[PDB]
């Protein structure tokens, strides 16, 4: 536990995580990329 | 219509639908739910 270095009054949101990937992550692979996950059939590039 | 419902019954009466005579593309099953647990036992979810 380390809620003394990942915490402060008024909050912090420095950390990040990925819920949206085109496939699973194979063992020991990094996937640093910011690509909007597709829904339906739209080539959409944007949030919403 | 099993993921678009409104009154998924309580566990004391587990609603049991039957799915037959159909083509099962689980990609739609992957769209109506930001999963928290896809634990598959008999089959691998990738090969469904
Ligand atoms: C479980 O819940 C499903 C979704 O509500 C039900 O499927 C539908 O039920 C409606 C009636 O509410 C039907 O008109 C429709 O054709 C479809 O079957 C399902 O019946 C229900 N199952 C049980 C056992 O309650
Ligand atoms: C349920 O059906 C409505 C009908 O318009 C749709 O907008 C909504 O996205 C559906 N939600 C789920 C979780 O299936």
From Swiss-Prot, chain B:
Instruction: Give the superkingdom in one word.
Output: Viruses
Protein purpose: Attaches the virion to the cell membrane by interacting with host receptor, initiating the infection. The major receptor is host ACE2. When S2/S2' has been cleaved, binding to the receptor triggers direct fusion at the cell membrane. When S2/S2' has not been cleaved, binding to the receptor results in internalization of the virus by endocytosis using host TFRC and GRM2 and leading to fusion of the virion membrane with the host endosomal membrane. Alternatively, may use NRP1/NRP2 and integrin as entry receptors.
**Impact reported for residue 4 to Q:** Reduced viral infectivity
Tell me what effect the entry lists for residue 7 to T: In strain: Omicron/BQ.1.1, Omicron/XBB.1.5, Omicron/EG.5.1
Full protein name: Spike protein S1
Specify the effect of residue 7 to K. Answer: In strain: Mu/B.1.621
- Can you state the subunit structure given in the record? Binds to host ACE2. RBD also interacts with the N-linked glycan on 'Asn-90' of ACE2. Cleavage of S generates a polybasic C-terminal sequence on S1 that binds to host Neuropilin-1 (NRP1) and Neuropilin-2 (NRP2) receptors. Interacts with host integrin alpha-5/beta-1 (ITGA5:ITGB1) and with ACE2 in complex with integrin alpha-5/beta-1 (ITGA5:ITGB1). May interact via cytoplasmic c-terminus with M protein. May interact (via N-terminus) with host bilirubin and biliverdin, thereby preventing antibody binding to the SARS-CoV-2 spike NTD via an allosteric mechanism.
**Glycan attachment residues as annotated in the record:** 4
Which residues of the complete protein appear here?
A: 340 to 387 of 1273
